[PDB]
Amino acid sequence: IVYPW
Amino acid sequence: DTQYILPNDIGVSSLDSREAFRLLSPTERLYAYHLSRAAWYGGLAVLLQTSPEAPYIYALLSRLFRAQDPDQLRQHALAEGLTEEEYQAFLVYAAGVYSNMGNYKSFGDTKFVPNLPKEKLERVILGSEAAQQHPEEVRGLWQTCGELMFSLEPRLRHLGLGKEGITTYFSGNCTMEDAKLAQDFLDSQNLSAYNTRLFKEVDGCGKPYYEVRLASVLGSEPSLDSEVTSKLKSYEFRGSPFQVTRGDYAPILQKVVEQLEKAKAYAANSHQGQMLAQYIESFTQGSIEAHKRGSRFWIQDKGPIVESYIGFIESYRDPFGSRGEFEGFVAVVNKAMSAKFERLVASAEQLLKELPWPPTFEKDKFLTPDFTSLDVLTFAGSGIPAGINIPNYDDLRQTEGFKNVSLGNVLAVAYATQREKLTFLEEDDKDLYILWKGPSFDVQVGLHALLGHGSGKLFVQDEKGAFNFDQETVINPETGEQIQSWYRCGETWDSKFSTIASSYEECRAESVGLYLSLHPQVLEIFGFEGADAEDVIYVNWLNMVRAGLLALEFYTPEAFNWRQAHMQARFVILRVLLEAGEGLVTITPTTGSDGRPDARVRLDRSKIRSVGKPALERFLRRLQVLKSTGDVAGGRALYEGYATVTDAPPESFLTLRDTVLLRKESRKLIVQPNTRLEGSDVQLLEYEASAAGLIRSFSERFPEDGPELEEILTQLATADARFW
Ligand SMILES: [K+]
Ligand SMILES: [Mg+2]
Ligand SMILES: [Mg+2]
Ligand SMILES: [Zn+2]
C-alpha cells in the first residue's frame, strides 16, 4: 500500500 | 494560509537523482528511459480520474507553456496588467495542477483555484502566443474549463459521491447506494474494480442503466483473448441492468504499451520480460488477472538494479474505496540505505510473535520479503509516498510474497524544517523533535511496511464448505467463542470495509509501528542504543500524537467525513491514547506569540510503557480480530467510534480544528527530472526547485508527442462530458 511523508 | 488556494511562497523541492542515475549501465538507462515514458504517459489518466475539467486545464496550460516559457510569459502577463504577485500565483497554480495531475489536492482531496482575478487571467490566455497560433483551440478550452477553474461552490470543494462532492470514478448522479450495488455485481461475476469506472444513465422510462467500463486499449471489437471478452455483454443483476464495456483511456494506454514493448528489449532477465509481457496484455485487454500474473513475476525478480511497478494500484481517491488510480515509478536500488532494512527482514519472523494476537491469526507460512531503499527517477500520478508495500493483491501476499520499498531521496526532502513552523509543541520538545525526527522516521517506515502491512491472516471459506483454517480449534480471543464470520469467494479487503478499508489498515499498521518501536532489538538494527534509543521512541510517539491533532485539517464536519486515510488513522490512535487518560497526553488551547489562538501538546515520557503500551495492545488485537473475521459490522463500530470528531470536553476538537487550519502549512511540491535520449546515450535533465522549474519539467516531458497528448485528453473528456 502506501506510507506518506 | 487560505483554504482552496496554493500559497505563493509554497515550498518546492527538486528530487535528487544524479548519483543514482550515474551508477546505471548504458543498457539499464535505456530500460529506465522507456519505463519512465510509459509511466508519464499513464500518469495523464489521473487527470480523467480527478475532475471533469482537469483534462481541459492540463491541455490549456500545456499549450500555453509550449509557446512561451515561464520567463517569456512573464513579459506578456506583466504587459497585460498583472502584478508580479499575481503572476506568481498563476505559476504556483500551474505547478500544482502538474504535480497533482488535476485541480484537486492528492493529499486532502480538496479543490484548489488560482489566486488571481479570473478577468485578468483571461486577458493573458486569450492574448498569449498559443492563442495567436491556434485561436479556435485556445478559446474553446477557456470557454469549457474557465468557469470550473475558479468555481468554489460548496459541492465542488471536496471529492465524493452524491451531490455532496465531485468524482469521475462515478457519474454525476451516482450515490453510495449505487456504488455498493455495483460492488456486489463485480463480486458475483468475479471481476476486479481496480481498472473500472461506473456510469449511470436513465432512459425515457426512468430506469437507471449501469455501465462498468474496463480500462483497456482494445474496444468493442473481438480480440484474441477470451478472458474479458466473455464478460463484454449485458447483464441483469437484482433487476438492475448492467453492461460491461472496455476501452477506457485507450489512446493513452496505447502510448504506455508502446514504451513497455521497447523496454522489454532491455530487460535484465526473463522475469522482467514476462512481467512486462503481462502488463501489456493487462492494459490492452483490460484484464486484472493478467496484471496479477505480471505482478507474480515481479515479486520473483528479487533485488533488481532498476526497480519498477505500474498500473491501477492504490485505491485512496475512490470515494467507495475499491477503484484504483493509475501510478507508476522507476527507481534505482541504494545498497547503503537498504542495508538496515535487510537486517529487519532477517529477524522479521521473530518480531511477528511479539504482536498482540495468537498465531492462529497470523499467516501460515512466513514468506521471506524483500525490503529495499530506492532512489526515485520517476513517480507519475497524483503524488509521491515515502514507502510502499506492493502488490495490493491479498492472494499474492499469502502464497507468493510481497516487496517493501523505502523511497530514499524522497525522505531527504521531508527532512527539512525550521523550529518556527513546528506548531503545537513546547520549545523544550521542539529541539528534541528536530534532532530525532529524521532517524526515528526510518524506524516507523520499516515497521509500517514489513510488520504492519506484512502481517495478518484473512479467514477465507472456499467454494465448498472448506476453510483455510481450523474452525474446531481456533478461538476468538475477544469473545472466547469459535469463528462465525469469514471472507467468501470474490470478497476482498476493499470489498467489505470499502470506505474505511484504507484508513483502517493504515491505522493497524501505524499501531504496529508504535508498538514495536519499544523493542530494543529493533532499535539496534537502526543503530540506536541507550539514551538515544529512548529518545527516538519518545519522538516517534510525540510526532504521532502531534500528527493526530494536525489531522483535523483533513476532516469535513458538515459531511462528517475524513478526506485522508493516514491522517484519520493518526487521529484514531490519538483518541485511543486519550481513552486511557491518566495524564498521558493532553491538548491544551493557549495563545500564540502573535496574539492568535494556539495549542500545546504534552506527552508524559514515563507513562508510555505503563499506560500507552497496554492501550495499543488491546486496540491492535481488536483491530486484527475484526479484520481477520471480516466482521465489518464490528469493524465500523470500533473504528468510526474513535474517528468521531466532536466538541466534547475537555479536548474540544471541533474548536481546535479552527486553530489547526489557522496555523496550517501547505504541503511541499516536488520536481522530478526528465530522461532524454541522444540516440546513443541517455542523459539526465534536472530543473529548478521552484514553480517555474516544475512547469519546465512538464514542458520537456513529452518532446515527441506533446501536442498530440493534449488532443487525446480533450477528446476523452469531451466524450464523457454528459456524465457530469
Ligand atoms: K481502499
Ligand atoms: Mg458527485
Ligand atoms: Mg501532489
Ligand atoms: Zn501504509
Author numbering:
A (entry chain B): 1 to 5
B (entry chain A): 3 to 726
The authors write:
Human dipeptidyl peptidase III (hDPP III), also known as enkephalinase B, is a member of the M49 family of zinc dependent metallopeptidases and cleaves dipeptides sequentially from the N-terminus of various bioactive peptide substrates. The “upper” lobe is mostly α-helical and contains the zinc binding site as well as the catalytically important residues. In both structures, two histidine residues (His-450 and His-455 in the human enzyme) and a glutamate (Glu-508) coordinate the zinc ion.
Similar to tynorphin (VVYPW), which is a derivative of spinorphin29 and has been shown to inhibit partially purified DPP III from monkey brain22, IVYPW inhibited rat DPP III with nanomolar affinity. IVYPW was in fact found to be a stronger inhibitor than tynorphin. In the present structure, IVYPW binds in the same mode as VVYPW and the other peptides discussed so far including the formation of the antiparallel β-strand interaction and the hydrogen bond from His-568. In addition, the zinc ion is coordinated by the carbonyl oxygen of Val-2 similar as in the complex with endomorphin-2. When analysing the interactions with the catalytic zinc ion, we observed that the carbonyl group of the scissile peptide bond is not directly interacting with the catalytic zinc ion (3.7 Å distance) in the complexes with Met- and Leu-enkephalin and a water molecule is bound to the ion. Instead, the metal ion is coordinated by the respective carbonyl group in the complex with the inhibitory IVYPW and there is no room for an additional water molecule. In the inhibitor (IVYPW) complex, on the other hand, the water molecule is missing. The modelled side chain of Glu-451 is about 4 Å from the scissile peptide bond and thus could directly act as the nucleophile leading to the formation of an acyl-enzyme-like intermediate. Based on the similarity between CPA and hDPP III, we hypothesize that inhibitory peptides, such as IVYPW and tynorphin, might displace the water molecule originally bound to the zinc ion. In this case the reaction may still follow the energetically unfavourable and therefore slow anhydride pathway.
